[PDB]
Symmetry: C5
Subunit: 312 residues, 5 copies
């Protein structure tokens, strides 16, 4: 409970490291994630410390009592992290080693503009309660920086884990102490999205395109409208895992293009039937033969252009 000793007149640089233990519940649509980890705090001090004179009499005279505990808080947590003290340790320089285990919810924005093939970057910020009898500074230990015990996140490939200090810039003077930025880069495992979402949609569209080899108006109308119904049903099927998104997405563009193709093919069928009724068979045949080679080429080209737009 004693104040930090200002004998050097130099800011108390504090070195800290967060050690991940288990990361689950990446609720995409909600933009949060559960985190269980080990928070390692270890500060340096000179006065009210002890030089090596105890030696074997007292190899490490540990203090159970809470002394000079640097009050650090997350800035992106609705509710303060869980507290569970594990162990304490002192160095022959008087520097205390503290360990704790906690469970938190962190609010980090997610960007789904390339939903199936996207890479996120989860953020955690650290702030320190700055004292008046001395100046405090947060630093990150390069070792102890953070590791995951070879944990795995379901459907994500963890890529790095990096700490970096940065000014608060919170427009408050006593709130200008530099904050810690814990960056966790992840990449989605996209393989199963192909056979689970992409291929059946193309299958339904290809099934509807068969009407360009048929002359029967009734059969063509049934094909195209029933395939539109199947498309809408399949969209209802796959929206359950798609997060709620008020901006343009790769997959949303693809869906819009598919609706537009359905409209254009109903138009083609109607024009062919009208021309046949008004007795222009050569013209009907030419339009349908043209459509045969024209629909898939234009679908391919539009997809290439969409992909070069969304993926650089």
């Amino acid at each position: 409970v004693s104040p930090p000793p200002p004998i050097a007149d130099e800011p108390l640089t504090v070195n800290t490291g967060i050690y991940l233990i288990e990361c689950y519940s990446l609720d995409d649509k909600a933009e949060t994630f559960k985190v269980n980890a080990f928070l390692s705090l270890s500060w340096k001090d000179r006065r009210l410390a002890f030089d090596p004179v105890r030696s074997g009499v007292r190899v490490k005279t540990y203090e159970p009592e809470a002394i000079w505990i640097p009050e650090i808080r997350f800035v992106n947590v609705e509710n303060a992290r869980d507290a569970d003290v594990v162990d304490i340790s002192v160095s022959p320089d008087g520097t205390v080693q503290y360990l704790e285990r906690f469970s938190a919810r962190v609010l980090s924005p997610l960007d789904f503009r390339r939903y199936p093939f996207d890479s996120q970057t989860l953020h955690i910020y650290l702030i320190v309660r700055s004292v008046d009898t001395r100046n405090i500074v947060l630093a990150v230990d390069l070792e102890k920086v953070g590791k995951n015990d070879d944990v795995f996140l379901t459907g994500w490939d963890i890529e790095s884990f990096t700490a970096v200090v940065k000014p608060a810039n919170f427009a408050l003077e006593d709130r200008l102490e530099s904050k810690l930025d814990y960056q966790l880069r992840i990449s989605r495992q996209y393989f199963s999205y192909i056979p689970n979402i992409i291929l059946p949609m193309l299958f339904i569209l290809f099934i509807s395109w068969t009407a360009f080899w048929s002359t029967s108006y009734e059969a063509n109308v049934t094909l195209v409208v029933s395939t539109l119904i199947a498309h809408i049903a399949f969209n209802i099927l796959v929206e359950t895992n798609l997060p709620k998104t008020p901006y343009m997405t790769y997959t949303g563009a693809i869906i819009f293009m598919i609706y537009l193709f359905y409209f254009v093919a109903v138009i083609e069928v109607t024009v062919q039937h009208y021309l046949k009724v008004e007795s222009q068979p050569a013209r009907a045949a030419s339009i349908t033969r043209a459509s045969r080679i024209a629909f898939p080429v234009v679908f391919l080209l539009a997809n290439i252009i969409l992909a070069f737009l969304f993926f650089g």
Copy 2:
């Protein structure tokens, strides 16, 4: 814990400002929203203060102990805000500067009568626990009024942030102290709603309108009824993000008009087939040619009238 000093006999005007840090979870259908922010309290006092005689001996003799803390509460919160003290500061006039970080849920009504192109106004009210040894008054600092650190809300354009005092009017005398009103104006980003909701519905309706170029009764019946089924399915698809609304809405009117158009087109098809069977071909042809130009014009006109009704 001491009482405010009544040496001026003049109400203790208290100046306060809420600083936004992160606003998320605008649950539309629920009419609440999560808020994380910094609450800055700073009152003035004359007695039990200190004039500048300490000077360099004590540039700012800060009081860790809680003195003259004005108990302020939100009036529109189910549960009291989180408490996390950050820092304290004193002025050479004895005026204390207090900062805190909190996380709250605020109950604000939302009006979705122009759902895709609407603008909301989130409200936060402040009340003060009024003491008996002195009179207290809440004021808002024009500076420190509130800022968002350039935060962004997903799918919303933040427009202003304004504080304004107003009488409680809570029909209770000791509850007549003027309250603070924090107004946050937002505007929805409507672009993606167009290709996500509006266009495919029109596409299905236009697809159903093709039956006015066909004579086959069976094909016409399949077209119109299958397109009605597709409309109902698409409504099931898009209701998931539409909030539960017990009043008339722009989009609800549009949906009702589309159901009515489907009914009228089944009627047209039936009348054409009946006239053809009863051998009035000229009349059948005239009705269908009329319908060709009559359905889209009436749809356009009704939409113009609906929009001039809902948007002034």
Copy 3:
């Protein structure tokens, strides 16, 4: 903490009033509702009071300390109400005025037998912890009875607010103290339910009824079965806001009648086709012409009878 003074040997009649501030979250299917309100407690006493001798020396010698606080509890709350003391006041008769703000969940049964045009009655019960050194009695102040600050509940018309005392009848002697009954009458705003639920169902049924003007068996079968499919889809669409109900409802009866009508019209179509095949054209024609005028009249009559059954 002192016991009530038994100097009159007469029960301590306590007068109380609940003042509504904000009522939201009327979760119909769950039969609860959030309530934020002001609870005003004010008891009378003679001993350990003070007559008007202080006068201007002490116009109102208020007691911050908690004295003779009547412990009152709700009986229909899963978890005790929130506590937030606001202010205290004393009368020159020694009678204390207490105010508080709270947030509660109240369990009240809802009766949806006339779902679109129903009127509910939310209930709140008050009980008092009865002491042994004196007798306590709960009364309600006619003024201060309760008001809503002109609050509005979304989709409901608030009608009255009435307090009434009634015996507990809880089969326990020390639990026989009369309880307070706070009754809040509300009426649903039914207008938007018409164009949102009722009309499209009738539209689909009328669309299916067109088969009585057609001779083609294939077209008739498509009409009637596709309209049945559309009915089921629309039911899936509108069940999302309908509360889970294990008893007969007006709307449930209507839905059952519509299923039955669909069955009877498939039967009519089949009988007409069978008679035509077996070469009884006059009889087929007579049955279909009869059905033309017979289906809507019987629908109208059944609806009148259903409504006189459910609405007196």
Copy 4:
């Protein structure tokens, strides 16, 4: 806080009774239920009691302080029950009467093998913290056993309420004290399930069976496959209230039988068309006439056998 007096060397038999006040939220699929009730504890004692010598001087010298409170806990509650002390009372034999109000969640397994016509049996178990200075025994008072104040549970008929003591059999010696078993028998009100679930399914199946009076292959195929689609849609409609069940159910069997009937009728239609094409009209006609009387009889017989299997 004093220990029970061992003057008789005989176990302290404790008599208790739970009085129901409000039972709601029977979440079927979750196998829990909310309970609000009054718990009445009343133990007997001889030493540190008082014989009738006070008389009118002290008709009942009540102890506000907590003395000899038997610590009883539920064994089937995730979280301990709510605590709200109401009143206390002493008998001229020194036996204390205690009352409390609580709100709990009880984990009781539900058996849905006869879902529409099933009867459940909710269970509540009581355990007592057994002391070392004396032996304690839990008994149930036949009067005070428990009543419901004529409460009603929505969609359930409450049948009895019975207490019964039974050995723990928890394989722990200090955990061998006999436990109390509170049994609440309920029966479902099945009437509305008939017109809400059962009849429309039969209506769709009967509608599909009409194809045995038609010769047109196209119309027969449309009838049967569209009715299959309607069946699947109606199943989606009614699964919302059906609890998640990993075992065989009466209704699940019925649904499986209906799918099988649909398969067999597509087979019948295909065989009739094949025989007609291969020019065996007598045989086609004989098969279809046979199917006419064979499908409903076999449906009836299978239903009788299913019901005698599931309902003894």
Copy 5:
């Protein structure tokens, strides 16, 4: 509160056992599970113990006060377990026996690659707060190891319950104490999944395969596309209980194969109609007769290969 006595200089081996009482709420898609159980802690000690000299004077001098309580924590729990002390007991060697009841949520990963016929293995880890005045060691009692009181988990067959110690390997020295691993093996009861999911899908596919016995293009197109729609609807019906899975699954493969078969059968129907129109009847007939025997054989073979891939 006293420190463990270091008179042997030998680590304090502590023996513990978890006794299951009720296991429910195996939320598959969430990878957690509720657990209610009895935790039995019993350590050995020599100093500050008592040899058998009390005898009948004090058969077991029990200590109500908390002495030498080994602080043990779960490592895979978001929030610490519930605490409810039941009883305490001492041995004539001074070894204390402790019992407690708790309610926890345990985070264990689930592997659904063989979803209908899979076997899980729920894990619980134990850690011990290691003290500085002595060395502590966690051991598991072979008896008292854990039992379930013949509890049953709905839809799962409990198979074993085994304890095993293992090094932490948490990369922290003071965190290197060996941890306990409680392994609970379960197997799913798959019977009802057959008639509930597997058979109706095959029924719809077999229904679509009938088009290889028909020549009518319109009827064939209706069969195949309506059966595709029914497949999508049935998938919507059965996804509600299937957990969200970002990897390949047996059932997901089966669904993909069924979509592919639907595509190939639309292709077959189109090619037959094209050849008939272009007047190659022998070739059309040969292709359709080939398809008759070729579709089911290839379905069978692909299923065998899929099953030998997913089940060794």
